[PDB]
Design a protein around this ligand. Structure first.
Ligand SMILES: [Cu+2]
Ligand SMILES: [Cu+2]
Ligand SMILES: [Cu+2]
Length: 439
């Protein structure tokens, strides 16, 4: 096939994407070995769904797993009566998700399970896929002429031909695997045919971070989790925490082979040591560097000019309330808290008013990085760690290093009961989740 593997794309037809998708244990060949994963649509990753604004999506999920499951339409500002974090599809049963894609939307989104207590093993086993909302901005020449690819960043560990089980330490840290894959392939080669690449990036890992850097090149950020920036932003590297997305332009500068790497990054994962005293927790330190893919430039590359503008970001109404949510950890118990509490599906933690704007101050008082995710209501990151954010764009995951405060501007959109949680999904399963009701 193509030198660069990418998930099969399913496109809406005549404004309708109608698709049956099974969640099933699936034999397959992955990274040169046979393994049985849990997949959507028989593939790892699941198929990429490509839609336009105002399309209707009608997705029937058939659960052929031995445990209940559901879908989270991660990043989509749709109703929590559709993107229902409390829904349970029992084994053997089916459920149809039907929604309209919002008119003012563009970017890379994704779908994965969100059944509390079971997310980490199901996501780690292979249950995820991308959703792309294509926009009229994709027709400006500087983007239309670029060579576009999706890069699903997800790691894996195998044991006896199956996803490796979760250990107690995995529940504390979030599980990372030794197979660091792109679109389910081990260090694939991308033989570029054009000098400008447009790369949609998705961190679909349980817990692994990707400190992205392309050898000898900057990256030009053009979209965050949930929409375009206002103009391209040059970066030397780009950290993608679990659940985050980005879109970048790569302007290949000369012929040759360039490594795209996940540079060493210390997210605060912990190990245990015994040095004659008692057993003590000790930092794992930075991750070892990983090569994600080999990028081969074309002959005599002459990249397009960057676009001068992308999408203006909405001027939001003045906020009507400021909220403070404090993240803490009990590492040895693998328990994780928001404002001193663990998730309870019966308890409403925040009550807000639809079509008002709130300021959310999220403070990480733990020692690990925590990627904070809010369902249903995309937000504008104002600042993190006391540093103003260098661009305006819709995000739905914000990474907090130890001690940092993020200030978010949160317009409340669809009414209903939804959740916010750490997207180290082990931490969510172990209680770092709360309930927001919008009325
Ligand atoms: Cu998610
Ligand atoms: Cu969630
Ligand atoms: Cu966390």
């Amino acid at each position: 096939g193509p030198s660069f593997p990418e998930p099969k794309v399913v496109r809406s037809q005549g404004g309708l994407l109608s698709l049956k998708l099974s969640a099933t244990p699936t034999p397959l060949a992955i990274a040169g070995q046979r393994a049985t994963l849990l997949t959507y649509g028989g593939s790892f990753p699941g198929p990429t769904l490509r839609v336009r604004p105002r399309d209707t999506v009608r997705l029937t999920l058939e659960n052929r797993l031995p445990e209940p499951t559901n879908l989270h339409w991660h990043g989509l500002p749709i109703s929590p009566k559709v993107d229902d974090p409390f829904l349970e599809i029992p084994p053997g049963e089916s459920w149809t998700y039907e929604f309209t894609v919002p008119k003012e939307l563009a970017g890379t989104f994704w779908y994965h399970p969100h059944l509390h207590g079971r997310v980490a093993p199901q996501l780690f086993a292979g249950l995820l896929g991308a959703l792309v909302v294509e926009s009229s901005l994709d027709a400006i020449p500087e983007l239309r002429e670029a060579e576009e690819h999706l890069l699903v960043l997800k790691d894996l560990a195998l044991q006896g031909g199956r996803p490796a089980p979760h250990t107690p330490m995995d529940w504390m840290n979030g599980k990372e695997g030794d197979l660091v894959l792109v679109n389910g392939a081990l260090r694939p080669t991308l033989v570029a045919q054009k000098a400008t690449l447009r790369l949609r990036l998705l961190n679909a890992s349980n817990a692994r971070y990707y400190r992205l850097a392309l050898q000898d090149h900057p990256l030009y950020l053009i979209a965050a989790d949930g929409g375009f920036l206002e103009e391209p932003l040059e970066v030397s590297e780009l950290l993608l925490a679990p659940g985050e997305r980005a879109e970048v332009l790569v302007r290949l500068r000369k012929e040759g082979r360039f490594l795209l790497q996940a540079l060493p990054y210390d997210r605060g994962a912990m190990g245990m040591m015994d040095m004659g005293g008692m057993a003590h927790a000790m930092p794992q330190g930075p991750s070892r560097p990983e090569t994600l893919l080999y990028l081969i430039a074309p002959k005599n590359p002459k990249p397009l000019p960057l676009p001068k503008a992308l999408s203006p970001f909405p001027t939001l109404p003045a906020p009507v309330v400021t909220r403070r949510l404090v993240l803490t950890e009990d590492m040895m118990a693998a328990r994780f808290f928001i404002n001193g509490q663990v998730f309870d599906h019966r308890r409403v933690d925040l009550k807000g008013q639809a079509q008002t704007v709130e300021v959310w101050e999220v403070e990480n008082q733990g020692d690990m990085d925590h990627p904070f995710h809010l369902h249903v209501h995309p937000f504008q990151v104002l600042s993190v760690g006391g540093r103003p954010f260098p661009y305006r764009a819709w995000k739905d995951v914000v990474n907090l290093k130890a001690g940092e405060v993020a200030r978010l501007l949160v317009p409340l959109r669809e009414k209903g009961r939804t959740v916010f949680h750490c997207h180290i999904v082990e931490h969510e399963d172990r209680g770092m989740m709360g309930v927001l009701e919008v009325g």
